[model samples]
Target: YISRYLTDFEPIQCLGRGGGVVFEAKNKVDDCNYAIKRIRLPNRELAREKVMREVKALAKLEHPGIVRYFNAWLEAPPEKWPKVYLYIQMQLCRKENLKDWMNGRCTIEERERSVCLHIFLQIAEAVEFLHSKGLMHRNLKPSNIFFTMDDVVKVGDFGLVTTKLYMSPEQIHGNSYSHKVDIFSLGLILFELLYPFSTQMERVRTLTDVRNLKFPPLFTQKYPCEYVMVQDMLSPSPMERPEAINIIENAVFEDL
Candidate 1:
């Protein structure tokens, strides 16, 4: 069953790898492109059940802002008794992820306003959808956010692991958190995009403020609306943070 599906996609190239490997492949029949992630694990029985639950959860999500999950299968090796692999197929985003795209630029020029807002709105909308479904995107870094060739947003890389850089204060303190954790992460991402951080020093300066939960006075003066929004999001108390829907519905974002 697994091998049959593998034959349907002609491997184009490897996308990335960690505990799991993602490949860019072309469907033989539909001639469409897709990203297939293959993960290796032990304990076949438990892994199968865990993977099924995860896949079903992903399959239930149907939204333009989210990466589309296509199919998945568990492949068992003939010689390996306990080892097995799982393959998950998803929509392909030929363009780079948001993190890489941001790093590629030395500085965001005249299009800063337009480009930042454009990209941010999509991310906000996607998060709103996930929250509405009672799901929290524990990982909301730029690396998990992708862009199609046309620059459409596609949030992916959902898993059990966590990214330390994007963790909220409460999370960092080892406290039980809620959806507000995602809002805190969103605030950091928005701040990162708004600040011109081309050099290592610039990035360090921005993150130092983040560690202190502060924003430069110049940034606040220049971007009043954004400052207010991000400030509220990065509030010390999770209760003070706005919901994803609230951010999307705010006056500054409504016209966007």
Candidate 2:
């Protein structure tokens, strides 16, 4: 899970969907775009080794599922600004995440419905690829899911990033949930798109304070016979949740 924190006065050189400070830069021979955040640490050097491993691991991971954010590290600007940006370089999606497409354009219900189901395979593939790498994606929600030049989903915030990187409490209005919080996050994203409840995703942000949410029946209706399997994806226990590979191969989605 990659974390992003841009100063209120100066966001990033390139701002991205969901508050990630992304921008492009050059390093002698390479050109890259990266996610960045202002340094908030007072004793930052303690993480130097950890940071190096993550950058190298990212470099090692050739998976298309993850964005390899190489290029650089958090550095203090010579100016008194005194902020260091955690550099995670990759293809920057300046707009939205997975739902970048789910914006107002999906206004028609039928179109929204089609678009929602269509991305299922792409997401499944991405998650499965990460899992195969022994990196449990405890943060596999959207925003982590974006489009690169390929039109294919480029699942972000995996491997090197921790759960703190993209906690989707906003995804579920910061709800209290289970050990499989990752599943809860993805379920929330799934329901959000499938239900298309809020476009701004504009929300009050607290379902507990509001009312208990009921998963829309239409979600099951389309999958019909596989309804229970859909519920399985939303399971709260990490063990209870199905593996990404299983979900990828078994859960029914309109074929690509």
Candidate 3:
């Protein structure tokens, strides 16, 4: 019987789910590791067309802050019926995603603030380039942001959109959205990156305050520029929110 997966790659472990189930797999041919995304297909023809459309777009994206796309293929179903799957080979992020990376550095220090701004700048750069190419991430969050072994931040998991805590006010209200929606999501992530939250209750409280458009009193003076930029990004009106390019060129990121 023919194998379902490519012979050149061996699955090492489950890397967790994003747009699809990703695995930390090793390429036998190159003797290197890669993150292989496995997306199950309900129907062969219809799903392949949908997946290929995004895959083709992903293949054209070439940015330092964006995850590098390698290749993709679809597996045929077995016998009369079983399951079909699409495999997307991509750059393996040896370092954990931002969600895990931020956990180790909860206490916000002056130096850490600078580092956080730099990381956020990288994220903005990626988003800016994506918008320039007429693409919207639509699903920007900590878990979708990964880092390489060298600590370079990379945005991943594009082409997936759904309702979540990071959604913009316009999105939550089921109104038509634009690129500003991404900026709104970025604001939530920026808050998470800069604010200290060691307890679940504290995180919940912060999110509740944010959803209600209440700016934390800490933003009154501390981290002046970031505070201002975050508030701007979380603007209830998408028209008032700054674009990714504007955020990248903002004064807050000047020193970073």
Candidate 4:
């Protein structure tokens, strides 16, 4: 079943462990390269729902920062092991996760600043786009972000995400989180990206940690241009955090 649909592709390497595996394929028609992610479904109903949800989310999202989802397919008939997979043709990136990049020694100050700003802009844009669609990326972290060879940041992995997590505190469990949750997560990312090796372990184990961490003063003093925008986005209260669009228009992208 898999061979029929994806014949030109050879399983080059396993990208990560978990249910998913990555393969390199050449489009038969145009001879173009693509990456295919194959995940086995445990059952029919759940798998179907996931596939549809991914399609829905990816279809509505059109931005340079978000990884593109080209198409999806399920194995058919007797070969029907009830397995499902998604084929996403993303722009290939040579750099590893941001965490790995940070581990590399001797990144210049100018290069570091430029990369930081670029990544921040892209992540903010992607989050804003998702929120505008009434969806929340519940898991926003460095591991989920990928960097291209040219330094473009691509936000990926939406399988565990849901709008339920973004509901108001009183809406679902009497303690719901809204789009501001993403704001908090972004702040953490910005902090780590700037310091990269700081030993200040602010307890991020609870909501209070998010509200009270003293942002590294050195980062703000050194990169005033980036820090000002991030500070506003990291505001404790959801109401105080600027709307995603405003963060871009009024703060980050303003006067550009």
Candidate 5:
């Protein structure tokens, strides 16, 4: 059956449950597969603004490592269904979220580290790109970063993102933060990826938790390259955190 928004489209299946629902849909124009995100608006002004912000940010972002927003539309009120729906079309990803992978039983050292490296590099690049464009992804958790069928990382979700945090500390407290906040979040991402076996939130509750948390000495001995990168990224002070460009150029892309 054809959907109201797109005459030739059909709702495939519900992807998950949350603030919005995701479905796999066929592009009526070309019959290509696409993911649709539908948010139920409660007629609140603030809620609408949040959705608009997310749409605006996604529309302007252009990066291979980031999910692309194709188009967005408001579903007209149907005779049977009176509520309005805000539908967003985006590129579809086959693989599950990082958290799902971590929870999928077990993984070997080499396998985990390989995946970790790939994820870290892509995340760094995506964030670096966003920062270069004066955008700051305020939320940089593992769940927000998705893995593709090719095992590549794709950063998504810009609803909480802003360019404010990249500013100086004085500016940060005064409602200004910059890309460096993303660096801090990246450090946390690296830490989680390295020590996936641990309970992340409880483990890295404080700076001391991050700085002093011990890794298997063998990780340092066997994977010095990974260790060094993680250490530099997880440095405590914001000043110590490397710029996104430097991170990509010096740390992530440099020869080991």
Candidate 6:
């Protein structure tokens, strides 16, 4: 059943892990490349509803900064496709996610302010859009932020699950979190991007640590303005964090 979709394409490699494996495939039809994400969901009724919910979410979302969702459909035939599962196609990011790229620059923290700032803005705008739709990214980290072939930064892996690495303090307490959680997550990424080589990042843990944190010399020296942005976004108090609409409209963003 799944073979029909890949008749003109060949599986290059797997994109992610677990039952939700995203296979990177090359299209022989036009020599183009795309990613095919397959998920082995539960029973038919539950899987159908869940997949349709994700499908509706993707269908309604339209932003250049967000990963484009091309198509999503259930895999089933007389033989069945693993009882039930979903396959989705999306744009293949050549350089992979921001996490892999950031690690590749382990030794280099200094980047073109304009370039890094541009990507940050793209991510912020994407988050803002999702919030506007009453959607919480739930997951916002380097691995979720991707770089397309054109070097465009687009956010992915939202809504389905959460990763503990950049999870906010509220989540740790098992408290219900709001969209502001994404704001905090973005701050974590920005902190890493601006101070990729900083030793102080690894020194902090827990809400108190981040709240009483001292910005590294490299961070303040190189990004005085951005330092403030990151600090506010990661505010220990959720309400202290600025809203996405406000962040996008702020004077600080004007220069970027």
- For model 4, residues 18-126, the per-residue Cα lDDT tens digits are 5366665666766666566666554668756876777666666777777765666655435533444445555555548765665562333534655666677788788
TM-score of 1: 0.87
lDDT (10s digit) by residue, model 2, range 34-138: 455322333356565566666575566666656645445555555553444555555554455775565554444544555665665566666667567655566
Lowest summed lDDT over 10 consecutive residues: which window, candidate 2?
A: 1-10
Off by over 4 Å in 3: 4-6, 42-47, 79-83, 160-163, 173-176
Off-target runs (Cα >4 Å) in candidate 4 are: 24-31, 42-47, 76-89, 105-115, 160-177, 198-212, 220-232, 235-239, 250-256
- TM-score winner among the candidates? 3
TM-score, every prediction: 0.87, 0.66, 0.89, 0.70, 0.71, 0.83
Per-residue alpha-carbon lDDT of candidate 3 for residues 1-256, written as tens digits (9 for 90 to 100):
5654557777788877554688888888888898887777655566657767777887888999988788888786567626767788888885568877776666776328777888888999999999999988887888789888888998867772223788776776676457788898888888888886788788778876876677678754676777778888988778888889998889777766
Candidate 1 lDDT over 19-61, as tens digits, reads 5788898989999999888887546567567767766777888
- Candidate 1 vs candidate 6: the TM-score winner is 1
As a TM-score, model 4 comes out at: 0.70
- What are the C-alpha RMSDs, in order, of all predicted structures? 2.6, 6.8, 2.5, 5.2, 5.5, 3.4
Question: Backbone collision count in every prediction?
Answer: 0, 8, 0, 1, 8, 0
What candidate 1 gets wrong by more than 4 Å, as runs, is 41-48, 160-163, 173-176
Looking at model 2, residue 182 earns an lDDT score of 50
lDDT of 6 by residue, 32-122 (tens): 7787777666666765677678777777788888777777766664552336567777888765588777666655434555666677888
Q: In angstroms, give how far residue 207 of model 4 lies from its true place.
A: 14
**Between candidates 1 and 4, the TM-score winner:** 1
Q: What stretches of model 2 exceed 4 Å from their correct place?
A: 1-12, 16-21, 24-46, 68-70, 73-86, 94-96, 106-115, 158-180, 198-213, 254-256
- Pairs of residues clashing in candidate 4: 169-176
Error of 1 at 123 (Å): 0.3
* Lowest summed lDDT window (length 10), candidate 4: 160-169
